[PDB]
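Project channel, design review

CF: Before we commit to the synthetic construct constructs, I'd like one complete example in the thread so the newer folks can see what an input/output pair looks like. Taking gsnqnnf.
RD: sounds good, go ahead.
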Amino acid sequence: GSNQNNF
Ligand SMILES: [Zn+2]
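CF: and here is what came back for gsnqnnf:
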């Protein structure tokens, strides 16, 4: 799957 990190 795809991953996104929003710090
Ligand atoms: Zn993946």
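RD: helpful, thanks. The pocket of zinc ion is lined by residues 1 (CB under 6 Å).
CF: DSSP finds no helices and no strands in the chain.
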